[PDB]
RNA sequence: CUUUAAAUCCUUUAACGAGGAUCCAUUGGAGGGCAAGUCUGGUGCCAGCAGCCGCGGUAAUUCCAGCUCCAAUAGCGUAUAUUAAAGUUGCUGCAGUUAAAAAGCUCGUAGUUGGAUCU
């Protein structure tokens, strides 16, 4: 947070889910910080860098993390557009 | 039909829980270094501070740039800086909410006497205030629960009719001198 | 509440008054029969005359016979029991004397091991029982 | 006497490559090794025992009396915990309770009342906890007001560090365990309540294994 | 001396006036709630204490006496009403399967509450 002077005063900011825009608490041990690697455009080799996403526990417990990461890949363009 | 006033109000207040450890320990502490007679005095101080914080609460409840809020706040901070519990640089409307009992008890007359160096102990300061030895702007003061204003702080001195600051000796030194001259011859 | 109309006030007031009627303490404090059944008549203390000395028995495992006084109050005239509170205080009272009675403090109900007794003894012969027990004042003749 | 790490988190802390447990709270790793807290939260950690309530099950070979230990832990800067241990004699109950309270500590967020001026002092919003039949309200209060509650949640809110709060209680509050756990997941819910200040799109840094994966695979078996 | 119809009350001021400043501070309590002795002696389901749990049957942390200690302090305790705590009268803001609870069911007049759309 800020104040009247305007500096940072909170200890940290929590990360948010990439599907439901909900934050992840400290005692939410079902959340996943998995990484997606991208390929080279010319050959398909591993270029070295990555890009990640985040999912909360309740989406996995209800059972729709797979189609959520599917639409995240659709907006990302890693999966094919026709699918 | 009589010409009577019939107006009075309680000055102290009793807490809800009589038997406890913690708040008893802090009030016994502050009686320890500040030299108070009994718990009723700090109950009066707590009631006065609760009243001024409550008044600050409905003062800050009202919206900004309101005439009566601005007038009441300016008068309240002027009173709080003229009694000396605040300082002249920090005039803000919500810093009244961040003060405690020791700020109220700092401007007590016993604390000023003890910190001005004309008394040995706080108990000695209390018994010397109760014995009418101090003039304050040429006025003899007896009450130990006396609020000293900021402008009336440099005029604390011994009374001119006291034997400590210069005057006639009292009953006991005159008695010792009389028995000494009686036993001398 | 449940009836949540904008112009619903008379029905809610009627429901509230009927439900506050359906209670115990309010019906005790707003009916004349409860105060009429009280032998004190709504008074904190009363004066009466000792007429006999009664030793009543106790309850289960607490077993100690207790000594009580049947007192007839002057203002209304009915036989009302009263309990001598402290040790060694039954010898201070005699026959045909005036006794200032009061309850134990549980609002007209039986207290503790003593059955059926809701009043105690405060003052006899215009002197307190505490003064006679401590020995501060002597019982007049 | 010297500490031997068994968890890779403990190895990463001992290798002087984990700066604080704060990033562990950010990435929400579970903790099952109760001296990372001893390493980070030092002498400022304060301990206070609540009440010892004996339990028993009726058997043929006599009444045996297992003991339940109730405890709170935490420094005066945030992090606060609770621990319940069931054992026979008192000393191992007290030790297990303070250890299990050292496992389950959560940090709290401190907010303001009206004006965001100075250091934060109160809860940022209204959070509650629900277990058993206990409802514990957490309403923010102005500066210097003090905690108005039962004595056990006064003790818990000074362990948490909230100097000023307004509370409310409902249900059978005589049972200390349900009421204490209701206060605990009430004050642990001060994070999971989204504010407009947290509307910025978050960026994810590397996973805590990902900076020193080579170091952990060459120094951990 | 002042004040006052005139005094008394307050204030000022002579002469006095404290070393156990004898110029002597009480009230209910000490198991829990609820801050305070497993102190000592006496009776031992009797006398009693106890608002409530419960302390008394011959080793009374509660009875009765002495010492110490805690609470407020010229004040403290008790009984009657009353308020908050009572979110145990719930308008905010109680519940109705099993803890007290929905008429056996249906129609139905006042009363309650009523779709969208006009720059």
UniProtKB/Swiss-Prot annotation, chain A:
<dbReference type="GO" id="GO:0006412">
    <property type="term" value="P:translation"/>
</dbReference>
<keyword id="KW-0256">Endoplasmic reticulum</keyword>
<feature type="modified residue" description="N-acetylmethionine">
    <location>
        <position position="1"/>
    </location>
</feature>
<keyword id="KW-0832">Ubl conjugation</keyword>
<feature type="cross-link" description="Glycyl lysine isopeptide (Lys-Gly) (interchain with G-Cter in SUMO2)">
    <location>
        <position position="41"/>
    </location>
</feature>
<dbReference type="GO" id="GO:1990904">
    <property type="term" value="C:ribonucleoprotein complex"/>
</dbReference>
<protein>
    <recommendedName>
        <fullName>Small ribosomal subunit protein eS21</fullName>
    </recommendedName>
</protein>
<dbReference type="InterPro" id="IPR001931">
    <property type="entry name" value="Ribosomal_eS21"/>
</dbReference>
<keyword id="KW-0963">Cytoplasm</keyword>
<dbReference type="InterPro" id="IPR038579">
    <property type="entry name" value="Ribosomal_eS21_sf"/>
</dbReference>
<comment type="similarity">
    <text>Belongs to the eukaryotic ribosomal protein eS21 family.</text>
</comment>
<dbReference type="GO" id="GO:0005791">
    <property type="term" value="C:rough endoplasmic reticulum"/>
</dbReference>
<comment type="subunit">
    <text>Component of the 40S small ribosomal subunit.</text>
</comment>
<dbReference type="GO" id="GO:0022626">
    <property type="term" value="C:cytosolic ribosome"/>
</dbReference>
<dbReference type="GO" id="GO:0003735">
    <property type="term" value="F:structural constituent of ribosome"/>
</dbReference>
From Swiss-Prot, chain B:
<feature type="modified residue" description="N6-acetyllysine">
    <location>
        <position position="65"/>
    </location>
</feature>
<feature type="modified residue" description="N6-acetyllysine">
    <location>
        <position position="115"/>
    </location>
</feature>
<keyword id="KW-0539">Nucleus</keyword>
<keyword id="KW-1017">Isopeptide bond</keyword>
<dbReference type="GO" id="GO:0005730">
    <property type="term" value="C:nucleolus"/>
</dbReference>
<feature type="region of interest" description="Disordered">
    <location>
        <begin position="161"/>
        <end position="185"/>
    </location>
</feature>
<feature type="modified residue" description="N6-acetyllysine">
    <location>
        <position position="154"/>
    </location>
</feature>
<dbReference type="Pfam" id="PF00163">
    <property type="entry name" value="Ribosomal_S4"/>
</dbReference>
<dbReference type="GO" id="GO:0022627">
    <property type="term" value="C:cytosolic small ribosomal subunit"/>
</dbReference>
<keyword id="KW-0689">Ribosomal protein</keyword>
<dbReference type="InterPro" id="IPR022801">
    <property type="entry name" value="Ribosomal_uS4"/>
</dbReference>
<comment type="function">
    <text>Component of the small ribosomal subunit. The ribosome is a large ribonucleoprotein complex responsible for the synthesis of proteins in the cell. Part of the small subunit (SSU) processome, first precursor of the small eukaryotic ribosomal subunit. During the assembly of the SSU processome in the nucleolus, many ribosome biogenesis factors, an RNA chaperone and ribosomal proteins associate with the nascent pre-rRNA and work in concert to generate RNA folding, modifications, rearrangements and cleavage as well as targeted degradation of pre-ribosomal RNA by the RNA exosome.</text>
</comment>
<feature type="modified residue" description="Phosphoserine">
    <location>
        <position position="152"/>
    </location>
</feature>
<feature type="modified residue" description="Phosphoserine">
    <location>
        <position position="162"/>
    </location>
</feature>
<keyword id="KW-0007">Acetylation</keyword>
UniProtKB/Swiss-Prot annotation, chain C:
<keyword id="KW-0256">Endoplasmic reticulum</keyword>
<dbReference type="InterPro" id="IPR006032">
    <property type="entry name" value="Ribosomal_uS12"/>
</dbReference>
<comment type="similarity">
    <text>Belongs to the universal ribosomal protein uS12 family.</text>
</comment>
<feature type="modified residue" description="N6-acetyllysine">
    <location>
        <position position="134"/>
    </location>
</feature>
<keyword id="KW-0007">Acetylation</keyword>
<comment type="function">
    <text>Component of the ribosome, a large ribonucleoprotein complex responsible for the synthesis of proteins in the cell. The small ribosomal subunit (SSU) binds messenger RNAs (mRNAs) and translates the encoded message by selecting cognate aminoacyl-transfer RNA (tRNA) molecules. The large subunit (LSU) contains the ribosomal catalytic site termed the peptidyl transferase center (PTC), which catalyzes the formation of peptide bonds, thereby polymerizing the amino acids delivered by tRNAs into a polypeptide chain.</text>
</comment>
<dbReference type="GO" id="GO:0005730">
    <property type="term" value="C:nucleolus"/>
</dbReference>
<dbReference type="GO" id="GO:0006412">
    <property type="term" value="P:translation"/>
</dbReference>
<keyword id="KW-0832">Ubl conjugation</keyword>
<keyword id="KW-0687">Ribonucleoprotein</keyword>
<dbReference type="GO" id="GO:0015935">
    <property type="term" value="C:small ribosomal subunit"/>
</dbReference>
<feature type="modified residue" description="N6-succinyllysine">
    <location>
        <position position="53"/>
    </location>
</feature>
<keyword id="KW-1017">Isopeptide bond</keyword>
<keyword id="KW-0539">Nucleus</keyword>
<keyword id="KW-0963">Cytoplasm</keyword>
